[PDB]
Amino acid sequence: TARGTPSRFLASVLHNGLGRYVQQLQRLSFSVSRDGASSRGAREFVEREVIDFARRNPGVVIYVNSRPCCVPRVVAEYLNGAVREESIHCKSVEEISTLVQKLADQSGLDVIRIRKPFHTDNPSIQGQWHPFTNKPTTFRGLRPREVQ
Amino acid sequence: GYVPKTSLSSPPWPEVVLPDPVEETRHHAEVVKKVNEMIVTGQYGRLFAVVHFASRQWKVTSEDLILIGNELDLACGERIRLEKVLLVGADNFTLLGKPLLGKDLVRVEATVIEKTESWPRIIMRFRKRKNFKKKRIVTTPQTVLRINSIEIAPCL
Amino acid sequence: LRNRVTDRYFRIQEVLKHARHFRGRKNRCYRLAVRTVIRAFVKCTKARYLKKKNMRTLWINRITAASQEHGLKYPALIGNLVKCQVELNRKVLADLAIYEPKTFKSLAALASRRRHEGFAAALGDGKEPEGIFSRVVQYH
Amino acid sequence: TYSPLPDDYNCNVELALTSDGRTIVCYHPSVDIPYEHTKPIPREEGPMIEQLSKMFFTTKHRWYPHGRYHRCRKNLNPPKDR
Amino acid sequence: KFTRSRIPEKVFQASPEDHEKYGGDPQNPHKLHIVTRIKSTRRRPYWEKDIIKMLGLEKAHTPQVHKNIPSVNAKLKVVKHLIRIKPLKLPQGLPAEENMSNTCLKSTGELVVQWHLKPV
Amino acid sequence: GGQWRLQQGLAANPSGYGPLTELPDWSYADGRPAPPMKGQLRRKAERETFARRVVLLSQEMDAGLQAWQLRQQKLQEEQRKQENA
Amino acid sequence: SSFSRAPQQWATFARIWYLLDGKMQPPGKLAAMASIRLQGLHKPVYHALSDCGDHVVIM
Amino acid sequence: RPRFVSLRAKQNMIRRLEIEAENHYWLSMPYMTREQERGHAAVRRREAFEAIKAAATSKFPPHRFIADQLDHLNVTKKWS
Numbered sequence: 001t002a003r004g005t006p007s008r009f010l011a012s013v014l015h016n017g018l019g020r021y022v023q024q025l026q027r028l029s030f031s032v033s034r035d036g037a038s039s040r041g042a043r044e045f046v047e048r049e050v051i052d053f054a055r056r057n058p059g060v061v062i063y064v065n066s067r068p069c070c071v072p073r074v075v076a077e078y079l080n081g082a083v084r085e086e087s088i089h090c091k092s093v094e095e096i097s098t099l100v101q102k103l104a105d106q107s108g109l110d111v112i113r114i115r116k117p118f119h120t121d122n123p124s125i126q127g128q129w130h131p132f133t134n135k136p137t138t139f140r141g142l143r144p145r146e147v148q
Numbered sequence: 149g150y151v152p153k154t155s156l157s158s159p160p161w162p163e164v165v166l167p168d169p170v171e172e173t174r175h176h177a178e179v180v181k182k183v184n185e186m187i188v189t190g191q192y193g194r195l196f197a198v199v200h201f202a203s204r205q206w207k208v209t210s211e212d213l214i215l216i217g218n219e220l221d222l223a224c225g226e227r228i229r230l231e232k233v234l235l236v237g238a239d240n241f242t243l244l245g246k247p248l249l250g251k252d253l254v255r256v257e258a259t260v261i262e263k264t265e266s267w268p269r270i271i272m273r274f275r276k277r278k279n280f281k282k283k284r285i286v287t288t289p290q291t292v293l294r295i296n297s298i299e300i301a302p303c304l
Numbered sequence: 305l306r307n308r309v310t311d312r313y314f315r316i317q318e319v320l321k322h323a324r325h326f327r328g329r330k331n332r333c334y335r336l337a338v339r340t341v342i343r344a345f346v347k348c349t350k351a352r353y354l355k356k357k358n359m360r361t362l363w364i365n366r367i368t369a370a371s372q373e374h375g376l377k378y379p380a381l382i383g384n385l386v387k388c389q390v391e392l393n394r395k396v397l398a399d400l401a402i403y404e405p406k407t408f409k410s411l412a413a414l415a416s417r418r419r420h421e422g423f424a425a426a427l428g429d430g431k432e433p434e435g436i437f438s439r440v441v442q443y444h
Numbered sequence: 445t446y447s448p449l450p451d452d453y454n455c456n457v458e459l460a461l462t463s464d465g466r467t468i469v470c471y472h473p474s475v476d477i478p479y480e481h482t483k484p485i486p487r488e489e490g491p492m493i494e495q496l497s498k499m500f501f502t503t504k505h506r507w508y509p510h511g512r513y514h515r516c517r518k519n520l521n522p523p524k525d526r
Numbered sequence: 527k528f529t530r531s532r533i534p535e536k537v538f539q540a541s542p543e544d545h546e547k548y549g550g551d552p553q554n555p556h557k558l559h560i561v562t563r564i565k566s567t568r569r570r571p572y573w574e575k576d577i578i579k580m581l582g583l584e585k586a587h588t589p590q591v592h593k594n595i596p597s598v599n600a601k602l603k604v605v606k607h608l609i610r611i612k613p614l615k616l617p618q619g620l621p622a623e624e625n626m627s628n629t630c631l632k633s634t635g636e637l638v639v640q641w642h643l644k645p646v
Numbered sequence: 647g648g649q650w651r652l653q654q655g656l657a658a659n660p661s662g663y664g665p666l667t668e669l670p671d672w673s674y675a676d677g678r679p680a681p682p683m684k685g686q687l688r689r690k691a692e693r694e695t696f697a698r699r700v701v702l703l704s705q706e707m708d709a710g711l712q713a714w715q716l717r718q719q720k721l722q723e724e725q726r727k728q729e730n731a
Numbered sequence: 732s733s734f735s736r737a738p739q740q741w742a743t744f745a746r747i748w749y750l751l752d753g754k755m756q757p758p759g760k761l762a763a764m765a766s767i768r769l770q771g772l773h774k775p776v777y778h779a780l781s782d783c784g785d786h787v788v789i790m
Numbered sequence: 791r792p793r794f795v796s797l798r799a800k801q802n803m804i805r806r807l808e809i810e811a812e813n814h815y816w817l818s819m820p821y822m823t824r825e826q827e828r829g830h831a832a833v834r835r836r837e838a839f840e841a842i843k844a845a846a847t848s849k850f851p852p853h854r855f856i857a858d859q860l861d862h863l864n865v866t867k868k869w870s
Contacts, residue, residue, distance in 0.1 A: 231671065443645055589696075
């Protein structure tokens with residue numbers, strides 16, 4: 001629920017789109033196992049798709065560590081310091097590919113409720129409304145019932 | 149058919165006489181020319197625009213962020229033109245489409261700044277005394293767009 | 305005790321984590337927490353309708369305020385904008401009222417212009433040419 | 445001489461249709477405040493809550509403290525927009 | 527008891543006043559109905575529910591094209607209080623195979639065979 | 647303003663048919679058109695099926711009338727041909 | 732526009748003082764006006780939780 | 791407690807009645823007669839029912855593949 005969960009506002013990392021787009025994902029770390037059915041999909045991904053992904057995303061450093069593990073994992077570290085760890089346990093090659101592409105396209109900001117679907121640093125161009133907008137002025141600025 | 153001036157003899161609202169069509173058309177031409185000259189000379193600062201994207205209308209300005217609630221099938225960092233611009237407005241003038249402004253007039257450009265999934269939304273159904281309880285978690289895909297620029301051309 | 309459950313701690317925590325921000329024992333005792341957490345989730349599910357309903361109500365109230373600031377009424381403003389073929393929705397209209405007072409005044413002027421153009425047509429129906437702003441753009 | 449709305453406040457609105465009639469131009473320059481419409485710049489718990497209520501035209505209820513429960517539920521690092 | 531209602535035939539015998547009002551000529555009758563369900567079948571008899579399903583009007587406000595022939599008209603008479611019927615108008619004749627993919631049904635009841643989506 | 651839109655011949659709902667919802671939402675900054683929207687594709691498919699049904703029903707009714715006319719002609723010509731003696 | 736953040740917020744959310752003259756006026760209509768102003772429903776920035784009410788002085 | 795009919799309810803009922811009157815008018819003028827329509831859709835109806843019957847009678851268990859059986863051996867595929 002929203003009330004039992006943190007929230008934030010729609011935002012970028014460093015105005016990521018203004019001058020140039022900078023891929024926020026910077027590091028991927030695939031802990032995979034030589035043996036074990038859990039990491040069969042991870043092994044096939046490393047064999048077939050990891051090189052293509054690496055060359056498609058030259059700005060992301062990809063580490064692949066083959067160690068004995070029961071649940072293969074991918075740790076994504078973003079420029080803003082965020083670290084997101086996702087288990088690829090028993091995931092097919094296509095599932096791992098989609099997950100990795102989602103990580104690459106995603107920013108480091110927390111996946112929590114976003115208060116507004118928009119964010120303007122300059123919401124007003126003609127001047128934010130205030131009670132005296134649309135109110136006519138009076139001669140000598142006389143308030144109502146003023147004698148003079 | 150004269151009626152003496154009583155409370156109900158005449159309607160309670162002021163009588164309005166609209167300007168004659170010929171003079172009003174000339175005045176419209178004059179005003180449109182003035183605004184077009186403002187556009188030509190660049191006598192405007194920030195431009196905002198009401199743009200119909202996805203299924204909604206967004207009030208937008210340069211450097212703004214927009215959160216579309218679905219995947220757009222676009223690579224991150226890809227530049228796009230938002231084509232359904234209902235309104236474009238500046239400090240001293242606004243242009244309104246009927247219902248859409250022409251392509252020649254306004255050019256709103258955005259960039260796919262991010263592709264993400266929404267936070268887990270809970271869908272729970274429950275009916276008392278029926279053993280009826282269900283729970284589902286849904287993560288809607290989302291795309292963050294950054295509006296780079298809003299351009300107008302003297303095509304009035 | 306051949307087969308005995310060993311995850312009950314985590315099964316309980318799956319609910320208590322959502323219950324942690326409640327009042328009283330509902331945030332501690334699972335028997336009480338589960339009942340209130342289910343109600344909380346049901347309310348969260350049903351609140352997506354009320355959020356949309358209240359946003360439109362809020363937008364309508366704000367547009368009514370903005371139009372009354374110009375002497376118009378919300379029905380007149382909305383109907384005459386539609387008749388002028390300005391398809392701005394209530395969310396955008398409220399945003400313009402708050403942040404673009406001059407543009408909103410222009411739109412209200414257009415609506416009142418149409419509302420008076422409408423009335424002239426009704427009075428002298430027939431012979432009178434369509435008002436300048438009453439002319440409708442046709443799409444095919 | 446017909447004006448869609450009073451021109452005194454907030455801008456001078458001028459509506460128009462383009463020749464094609466498919467777009468509406470609004471020219472709304474802001475109206476400045478006339479100089480003549482301006483003036484020269486001039487040159488115990490119970491009693492405390494009553495004074496504050498009189499000052500800020502509120503009721504007594506909001507000036508009484510709250511319990512630790514609420515004081516700690518309150519978020520001290522709320523998200524900030526713009 | 528509540529039973530099926532037999533509508534007397536005189537109800538479905540238009541008069542010259544009706545012809546003038548609704549703009550339909552008794553000679554040269556229209557060929558196709560556009561029928562939309564504007565009322566819920568709930569709280570209506572099961573036979574009306576069945577007729578609605580047969581005519582394919584399960585979704586409200588979704589126009590369906592039907593033949594203007596006696597049997598379809600009998601069904602439409604059975605479920606007339608739940609639907610809106612308007613003649614299908616073909617200003618450019620029925621669509622050809624070339625323009626079968628560019629048709630559009632206006633709210634006026636006209637199937638236009640071009641949908642250019644541009645100002646006239 | 648559903649009634650006014652109907653009077654002008656547009657969809658009662660502005661979200662219905664028209665430039666606002668039928669036209670593409672966006673295109674590449676280069677100028678290349680965007681792939682058709684899923685809703686637009688679905689609407690086009692539905693409209694094509696509706697048009698095909700209109701054509702089918704019209705053709706079937708016309709063929710039925712022609713067949714009835716031919717049957718009447720055959721009956722009358724046969725009853726006339728029976729007068730042979 | 733061009734105001735600093737705090738002055739802009741203060742101006743936007745400031746509470747205005749209105750004057751109603753009750754002479755020969757229906758109390759119901761007076762109350763409708765006063766209630767709108769007190770709730771702040773006459774402000775486009777209105778919200779129930781914004782405490783955007785205004786002062787109404789009825790004589 | 792008694793209930794009462796408002797002008798809005800009366801107008802809603804009148805609008806519905808007007809729609810139904812137009813329905814009566816448009817149903818009052820059939821295109822073909824019953825004798826003309828008799829049998830004009832028989833061929834299409836028969837073809838539709840033939841398709842339904844074919845679909846009903848084509849129900850049968852799906853094929854089984856040695857590839858599907860043997861692919862399960864991949865669960866223990868490792869790196870040498």
